[PDB]
Amino acid sequence: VKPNPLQDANLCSRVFFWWLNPLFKIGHKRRLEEDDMYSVLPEDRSQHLGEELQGFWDKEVLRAENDAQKPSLTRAIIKCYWKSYLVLGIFTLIEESAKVIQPIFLGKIINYFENYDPMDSVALNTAYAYATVLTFCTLILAILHHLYFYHVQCAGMRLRVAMCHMIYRKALRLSNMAMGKTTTGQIVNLLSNDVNKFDQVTVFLHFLWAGPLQAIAVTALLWMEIGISCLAGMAVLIILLPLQSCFGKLFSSLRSKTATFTDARIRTMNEVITGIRIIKMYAWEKSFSNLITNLRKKEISKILRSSCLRGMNLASFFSASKIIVFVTFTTYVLLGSVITASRVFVAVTLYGAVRLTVTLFFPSAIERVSEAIVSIRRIQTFLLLDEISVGFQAYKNYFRAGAHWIVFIFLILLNTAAQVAYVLQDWWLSYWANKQSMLNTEKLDLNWYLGIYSGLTVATVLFGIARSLLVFYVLVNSSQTLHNKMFESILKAPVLFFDRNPIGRILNRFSKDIGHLDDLLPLTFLDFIQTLLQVVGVVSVAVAVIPWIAIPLVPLGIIFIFLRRYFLETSRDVKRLESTTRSPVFSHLSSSLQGLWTIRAYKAEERCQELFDAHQDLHSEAWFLFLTTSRWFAVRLDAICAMFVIIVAFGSLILAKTLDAGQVGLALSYALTLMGMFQWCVRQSAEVENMMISVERVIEYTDLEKEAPWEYQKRPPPAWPHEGVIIFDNVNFMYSPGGPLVLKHLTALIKSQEKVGIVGRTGAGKSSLISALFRLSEPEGKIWIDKILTTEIGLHDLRKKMSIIPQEPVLFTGTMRKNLDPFNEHTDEELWNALQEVQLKETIEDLPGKMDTELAESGSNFSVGQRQLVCLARAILRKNQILIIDEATANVDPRTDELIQKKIREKFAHCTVLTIAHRLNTIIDSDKIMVLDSGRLKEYDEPYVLL
Ligand SMILES: CCCCC[C@H](O)/C=C/[C@H]1[C@H](O)CC(=O)[C@@H]1C/C=C/CCCC(=O)O
Known part of the structure; x- marks a missing residue:
């Protein structure tokens, strides 16, 4: 398989994660795909994390149901995972007592300068000891924290993997009654949105008992240096929570609207x-x-x-750290005291240590815990119901447009x-x-x-x-x-x-x-x-205080630039391995929830459990690398962040003269x-x-x-529909710039007031004659329309004078006055006359407004007949000379089509019509007909000769 080195790795070698270098040496050149990530420990499988919690929960349910009470699930978790956090609390108790000792040994170095005699060596080594005690807390805070963090992060994935297992195991015992009520969408939401909140809870769980303890210690240490004046700095630090929560709950409304x-x-x-x-x-x-x-x-x-x-x-x-110091020190000065340099910066550091943690960590933990308890209650309610019997241009272009x-x-x-x-x-x-x-x-x-x-x-x-x-x-x-x-x-x-x-x-x-x-x-x-x-x-x-601290800074600033790239090379690959390996879990769950009956029919309900365990172990593997690759970098960074301080302190000491x-x-x-x-x-x-x-x-x-542009300057006569004569030439077509031609040498001649019909074989270029008149795709050749071409005139000035009748009408979201006349250029009574002439006047009479009848659902409230009727109404009100009819017959025989045909034949005053159709019977009584072969055209005079 793929033995992982996390085991067989002595201490002093997993604090710096020295076992994870080969992966970087590889990913640096090859883009590992799926077979270069290691396996998981034995105590991280699902079968081992699901059975123990199931047993604990079953024992809890039994004990509860014994005596008349309601069973809980927050007691069957803590009964299994108490020693872990009991051991993890010792450290967070040891690292909170180190952010309080630094300012106390910082105020003892400074005190050496206020009382400084060059010829005294018994008081100079004690300062070195003080500075040495100050370089053991930084190491704890900066180096030994990234292993405790990894462990407290791993203590959540176990819970998240244990829940899903029993959840699924429950989804195969459901009965018909309880199954037909709840939808699979909610059962998948349980697994996709709720369990994913257990990875952040355990991180923000210690800020509930270590927040109210730090403040007391700090406000008791401050009292010994400056005095009562400390309170004036703790009142400007408790008001921010009220003055920000209300403003945030106000802010939410703007987002909503x-x-x-x-x-x-x-x-x-x-x-x-x-x-x-x-x-x-x-x-x-x-x-x-x-x-x-x-x-x-x-x-x-x-x-x-x-x-x-x-x-x-x-x-x-x-700038909240400047309003506290000002007040406290102006008070300390006005009361009657004098100012020194050993209290000021101690107080500064203590304020900076308190305000941040309190005002940024105490609030979020409560929200996290509340969400977690909500999810736990949902899962509990589930588990109890019945069962079965780039570059720089991308920055200029974005900044110079502002x-x-x-x-x-x-x-x-x-x-x-x-x-x-x-x-x-x-x-x-x-x-x-x-x-x-x-x-x-x-x-x-x-x-x-x-x-x-x-x-x-x-x-x-x-x-x-x-x-x-x-x-x-x-x-x-x-x-x-x-x-x-x-x-x-x-x-x-x-x-x-x-x-x-x-x-x-x-x-x-x-x-x-x-x-x-x-x-x-x-x-x-x-x-x-x-x-x-x-x-x-x-x-x-x-x-500026020690000019000799510019020689090492350059060696320290050249390693960062290379380390960043050496990490980012293979850091942008694990995200893909995580997502692509996560999706199959939900895919398989959805696939299995539906096809259930075919499973119970046979005594095979565990094979799918094995497949689910296998599908989740891959995500576990791909998640076990994210944490380690994120921690392999922070240690190297904190090394520098901590060497800086040591250099500063010891320089200050060896330059005390x-x-x-x-x-x-x-x-x-x-x-x-x-x-x-x-x-x-x-x-x-x-x-x-x-x-x-x-x-x-x-x-x-x-x-x-x-x-081409919409309007040229060579305007046409005030009215240029006079004599519709759409003559043609050997024009061709080209959909793609170098694609195949769907039309070849269509030289014809259409006369004024002559109804024409086009017939052909579906797919031989019959629906391509439309793209030349409206010139959607600019064709080659010449097309004269009333003594003038269609190529030396703007599109609008042409498209506006040729009315089309599409095959499938469409209605737009709005009133019944917009779809007929978006630009107010006519009179209401004219629209009424048109509507009643198209055999639709009472249909709108029913609705309330008669001018504000909202329609939606893409014109679903009407039938294709009414849609074609309103399109004919559009065409009528437009009142143009040329008319391009199209048709796609898929409706029913009743009076709809007969009426629209009668109206097309009688209403229009024989104004240069030309029709398209597929049914041979539809094109009858026409003057001239066009038979469209597979790319050419061989017309005849009248239909009396055609047959
Ligand atoms: C101005 C803000 C200073 C404090 C930010 C602090 O350094 C957090 C840093 C982030 C950064 O991504 C690397 C790291 O270790 C932290 C990742 C965890 C974030 C959530 C918990 C932070 C948590 O423990 O609260």
Whole structure:
């Protein structure tokens, strides 16, 4: 088979995942397909994860049913998986007591500088010990965390694989009564949407008892340094939850109404893309343009506000750590105390450690657990019922369609000032401290020192708020202007581009690509640039204090660029192995649920269980690699993220003779903040470059074929239907640019007011004479129509004067006044006269409005007879001279067809008609007939000679 090295691998070799290199050495050159991924451990099969839980649940049900109570399932899980989490809790108890010891040994190094005598070696080694205790917590946090994370992630897939097994095992004991009620759709939703929530629960399960413990320890440590003034920093940290939950539940409404706005646009686009051969022939391209532009305008007007909300939320998350420190320290200073450099940065670090975890992790865990319990209750209710007896162009084209480059020069200067203020606000405190220490009572004036601080604090907020809104606007205008180009381009592409491409493709494009452009890109771009600018400030602050930390940074910045590619090469292959191996599970489940009776008839109900186990083991294999390949990278990254700190600290120590406390504390407090942002910065770029493919494929349009224009300048006479004389020549056809000809040398002669009929063999080019008059596909040759050609005149000026009668009518979503006259150019009584002349006046009398009778379901409420009648009404009201009749007889014999034929024969004042048909009897009494052979034509004078 494929023995995996996860076993037979000593310790100190699976902490760095040293056993997973050959896979990368292989995938680097060959694109492993399916047979290069290892198997699973023995204790990860389904037969081993399904039987034990089934036994526990059966024992629970028995014990319960014994005494009068209701049985539960959340007690049969915990009875099996308690030792695992009992052991996993020790670590999270050990790593939460390390984020509290760093700031306590950071405040003891700084204290060496305030009291510094160069000729004293008994107090310099103790500082080295303090700094050494500070390099053992970073290793724990950064290196030993990625194995505990893998294990707590693997502790969920076991549950998710155990549930599905018993679920399926239950789906083969159902009785007829209980089966006919529930639909298979819900049984598959159980497995496709619910169990998939057990992979995130166990991750967010320890933030419920380790969140309320960290805050107490931190607010008890703060009291020993500064005092009561700590409370003034914990009140600006509990208000954010109220002031954000309500705003989010307000935000949801905008999204709801935006969706209910945009659904109609997609519906109308679906209705347009199908039936384009009728619109392009009736010249009705503008109405849809207008009633699409309106909806798009409304959608944009409703999206702007949501975008502003999200931008303000991001800007509030950016600069919340500056409103706490300002208040607490202005209070600590106004009460009567003095300021030093050993308390400030300790408090800074503690605040930064608390606010993040509390306000970002405590809320999500509750939602996760609630969803999990809901899913568990659903599955429980199920299990108890009865049984049986790219490139840079793709960025320019997307950024230069948003605004002039002046805006791209303004937002740069707007982004490169918020960070400057973010750093100067902190530098001011070090300046204050170093000026205080030099005293011996000539105290310090508070006005200056305390006003400059408020100024630096306000500028940050203003410059952090403006940027988000500006970026959002600049990035939404781009989509706003691309969609219009796309739409206006599709209304002119010939029909050739349509019959080869399927509707689903274009519609999925218009929906999903635009959704991505309008919803997700700006947020990711903004977060990425923000988290990328924070790091540069950290580095530039650490360098300016110790210029000798620029020599190793270059060796450390060249390994990242190669490692990223060495990983991404084979990281973009496992996703395919996951998806393609996941789909067969649902496929087999659906296939097996239907064909059930044919299974119970025979005593073979376990073979399918073996097949299901086999089909799930492959997904287990392909999922066991995702976690390991995601963890093989974070360790190497955290190695650097942690070596930086060691370098900084030991440099500060071996250079204690040429600096002071303020700047070293400033450097350390910024270096101890690098373990969270680096991962996010390196992780968002992946999503960005993944979803830019929609941008790429959208610009595939905006540059396509383009037929002749709609209107020239050589206008025709005010009325040029005078004498319909459609003469012909040796013109030919070409559907494809180099395809076969379906018509050869059709030189004929049609006279004014002469009803003509065309007969032939179905498939010999009988339905191709239509594509030359309306010139859908520009043919070769000459076609004179009343002393003038059809090639030196715009399409509209021609298509508008030749009325067609299609074979299969179609109705459009709207009133009964639009389908007959979308452009108001006639009078109501005229429409009434036409309708009553087409034998339909009482049919609309029944309905309420008589001018607002909405019809839907693609004209399903009427019969083909009424549809042909209303089309004849269109033709009548149009009142043209030429008339092109087509027919496809598949209706019934009753008075419908007889009446339409009588009307065609009597109503029209013998105005240049020419008919098509297949039934020989339909074409009778005509003047001249056309027999269409397999590519030529041999007509005769009258039907009296034909037979
Ligand atoms: C500004 C945000 C700083 C904190 C983000 C933190 O570094 C999470 C990073 C992500 C990144 O994909 C790599 C990694 O290990 C984390 C993946 C897990 C995310 C969900 C649980 C995060 C969780 O434990 O809560």
